[PDB]
RNA sequence: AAAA
RNA sequence: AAAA
């Protein structure tokens, strides 16, 4: 699936010019037609600054005013139906109004918007045009794209192209080439940051500190993350460190994460004070890093949702999860660890024993006086530590035990063992 | 070490205004003086475009023109002269003259320039200003900056701050606030690229096929790299996959890497045609991804050179190297592998046994089942695979051998063994890309 | 070329 | 420690 993203400023002030790109030529005031003609994208995203808004009655009359004039202009040069328009929150003192807020709200807002548009299934071919955006909006849009495509690259092949035209110089211009300024095959980069302190999800820009303590107290998100923070960090660690059984058991509730983000989102929007006479928007809450982390976490969950197999969690299923999720030395580590448990299960099967609800240490046949659960042993053995995992073999009549054992041997963490592992993986994620 | 990097356009076109930043305030046409007042950097880097220069009698009269005008502008404003100026190869047809070539030249040029500036020892606090920058130069400077800092963050703590001022609107503007648009603890990202084909180092932009083929065919770099490729990729993989013995045995020659980057950079430089009459700069050669990879490879080697030692490689040495290079489950896996060989050395020592030039499989006491060398076992055992490693125990008189065996036990790849590991690690680096 |  |  091919995707085109473009960073736009004040699209009206652009002049009639012609553009060359990929054995084609075009005439008009923007690059989008000839980009759409050569690239043939399955979908197009237009990131604009809201600061081009003129009518200041409220927030919906700014998001509307801007969307009216955008859709007018896309008709003028024929950009078709397959188009999403992200009106990011810009800032500054302009001719037709004022806009005050955190500069970084544009990143978090566009991160959030992109994370609902970019597909979570199949391979991605992403095309980015920086020709006519603001310096900071184009930079923040770029970083927001790469942050999400990095997570997408875990499960799928992701290629990224960035474009920019020859500079438009008004007095001496004949035609502007669309120069390719980047081509990269995007590296798989799973979420590798903990969830921050419960002060870094929404922050007060121009809100009184006593009023903040009031609204922070009413948000059900921060109270529900008080419980789940450690269970979610355990899942983040599962991908980063190669713990396939922890990946499955700690798999987050996607409906629940949707609702946390929706609440922080509409809480932010509802703190935007619009004065129609002073012509001045004021975003009194700013998005914190924690909002970013939840959006990246939800995106990583959607990307990997296909790998959440039905219980019980057998060796054959853990191999299958691992083969999709991990690469390099991590994948081979996990395969040797599962292979060890499988070979033991084969030996048992040949003797006609099928141990049920046996600690992994007893299954592998360990000495006593090594029951302490260490970081080293949890991370070095793909999270399959001898003192925190319980093994079960569902009894069957073997014919080819070397093939059957993997399907019939099931692993789970003991309730005590899962809390120790959560603590270890969460701590290791914070020391990073 | 605090570093300020600043993306600039036509500084002569900018209007006088006021800037707010970190409690202090500033009158002037540029953000740099207040950025310096508040951040108090140890060194400042200004990144701007060739396309500002006005003298086409030579390519070196064109850079000293831009440099002189930049030096004069720093006098006009409060800014100090403690600065490096990077004049990147820009594109476009302007009134004062024309500039043609690959747009991606700016990326590779700035990457190269920054690799010679960014210190390869100590922690790094990096501050990046994009207010005055032009779109592509700023994206490409940001990109090149992050790519090098990611390699730096393997050995040292690196923090990245990014700034952009409120947008400027004529006469409405009283004071432009300088916003922080990024604050990042830079993740350790070792190089995960193979060296590409000999098509992708220098390419012809505007040059006859035969003249290019002559220039390409004159490069010592491409001939040497043909044979050196696999050892360098084996080294790249050692950082990525957690193979501490391969890191030491395959540590590249910095002199040769320096030599390859100088040659390709001079070939590119010398292929710039400056037409004095009709005011035109044509860069007849373009940099390829291969140039970028080499610049990054040398930077990573400079960053890690402090870990290298002479040929006898002890378990204690592999421990201390691993604890600097590796993190997460990769580090913990390496320590378990070393721990196993250490614990076997302790056992041997208590018996008064000190085996020499013995295969690791015989050292650990293995079956005759599996002699084949597989990617699975090479990558899962931190490259310490039983059929490619030789153990040597330097004889001593033990008293507390649990603490003594580490220094007196040494690991070597066999000549056959090392070639098997080079293939597996090289192939795995190319399959993972 | 601080809204190609 | 069936390369724990």
JSON list of N, CA and C (backbone and C1' of nucleotides) in Angstrom, two decimals, chain B residues 15 19 132 168, chain C:
[
{"chain": "B", "resi": 15, "resn": "UNK", "atom": "N", "xyz": [15.04, 40.26, 8.89]},
{"chain": "B", "resi": 15, "resn": "UNK", "atom": "CA", "xyz": [14.57, 41.56, 9.45]},
{"chain": "B", "resi": 15, "resn": "UNK", "atom": "C", "xyz": [14.93, 41.62, 10.94]},
{"chain": "B", "resi": 19, "resn": "UNK", "atom": "N", "xyz": [13.66, 38.60, 20.35]},
{"chain": "B", "resi": 19, "resn": "UNK", "atom": "CA", "xyz": [13.55, 37.14, 20.64]},
{"chain": "B", "resi": 19, "resn": "UNK", "atom": "C", "xyz": [13.50, 36.94, 22.16]},
{"chain": "B", "resi": 132, "resn": "UNK", "atom": "N", "xyz": [15.72, 29.68, 11.16]},
{"chain": "B", "resi": 132, "resn": "UNK", "atom": "CA", "xyz": [16.29, 30.41, 10.00]},
{"chain": "B", "resi": 132, "resn": "UNK", "atom": "C", "xyz": [16.57, 29.46, 8.83]},
{"chain": "B", "resi": 168, "resn": "UNK", "atom": "N", "xyz": [7.46, 34.70, 11.96]},
{"chain": "B", "resi": 168, "resn": "UNK", "atom": "CA", "xyz": [7.65, 36.17, 11.79]},
{"chain": "B", "resi": 168, "resn": "UNK", "atom": "C", "xyz": [6.64, 36.70, 10.77]},
{"chain": "C", "resi": 1, "resn": "A", "atom": "P", "xyz": [11.24, 28.28, 1.62]},
{"chain": "C", "resi": 1, "resn": "A", "atom": "O5'", "xyz": [11.30, 29.86, 1.28]},
{"chain": "C", "resi": 1, "resn": "A", "atom": "C5'", "xyz": [11.62, 30.83, 2.28]},
{"chain": "C", "resi": 1, "resn": "A", "atom": "C4'", "xyz": [13.13, 30.91, 2.41]},
{"chain": "C", "resi": 1, "resn": "A", "atom": "C3'", "xyz": [13.55, 32.11, 3.27]},
{"chain": "C", "resi": 1, "resn": "A", "atom": "O3'", "xyz": [14.52, 31.67, 4.23]},
{"chain": "C", "resi": 1, "resn": "A", "atom": "C1'", "xyz": [14.86, 31.98, 1.38]},
{"chain": "C", "resi": 2, "resn": "A", "atom": "P", "xyz": [14.57, 32.29, 5.70]},
{"chain": "C", "resi": 2, "resn": "A", "atom": "O5'", "xyz": [13.30, 31.56, 6.40]},
{"chain": "C", "resi": 2, "resn": "A", "atom": "C5'", "xyz": [12.10, 32.26, 6.78]},
{"chain": "C", "resi": 2, "resn": "A", "atom": "C4'", "xyz": [11.52, 31.60, 8.04]},
{"chain": "C", "resi": 2, "resn": "A", "atom": "C3'", "xyz": [10.04, 31.94, 8.20]},
{"chain": "C", "resi": 2, "resn": "A", "atom": "O3'", "xyz": [9.32, 30.80, 8.73]},
{"chain": "C", "resi": 2, "resn": "A", "atom": "C1'", "xyz": [11.23, 32.74, 10.08]},
{"chain": "C", "resi": 3, "resn": "A", "atom": "P", "xyz": [8.90, 29.52, 7.82]},
{"chain": "C", "resi": 3, "resn": "A", "atom": "O5'", "xyz": [8.77, 30.14, 6.32]},
{"chain": "C", "resi": 3, "resn": "A", "atom": "C5'", "xyz": [7.71, 31.04, 5.92]},
{"chain": "C", "resi": 3, "resn": "A", "atom": "C4'", "xyz": [6.44, 30.25, 5.63]},
{"chain": "C", "resi": 3, "resn": "A", "atom": "C3'", "xyz": [5.91, 30.46, 4.19]},
{"chain": "C", "resi": 3, "resn": "A", "atom": "O3'", "xyz": [5.42, 29.18, 3.74]},
{"chain": "C", "resi": 3, "resn": "A", "atom": "C1'", "xyz": [4.21, 30.83, 5.68]},
{"chain": "C", "resi": 4, "resn": "A", "atom": "P", "xyz": [5.14, 28.78, 2.22]},
{"chain": "C", "resi": 4, "resn": "A", "atom": "O5'", "xyz": [6.55, 28.13, 1.76]},
{"chain": "C", "resi": 4, "resn": "A", "atom": "C5'", "xyz": [7.39, 28.73, 0.75]},
{"chain": "C", "resi": 4, "resn": "A", "atom": "C4'", "xyz": [8.30, 27.65, 0.16]},
{"chain": "C", "resi": 4, "resn": "A", "atom": "C3'", "xyz": [9.57, 28.26, -0.44]},
{"chain": "C", "resi": 4, "resn": "A", "atom": "O3'", "xyz": [10.72, 27.69, 0.22]},
{"chain": "C", "resi": 4, "resn": "A", "atom": "C1'", "xyz": [8.58, 26.72, -1.96]}
]
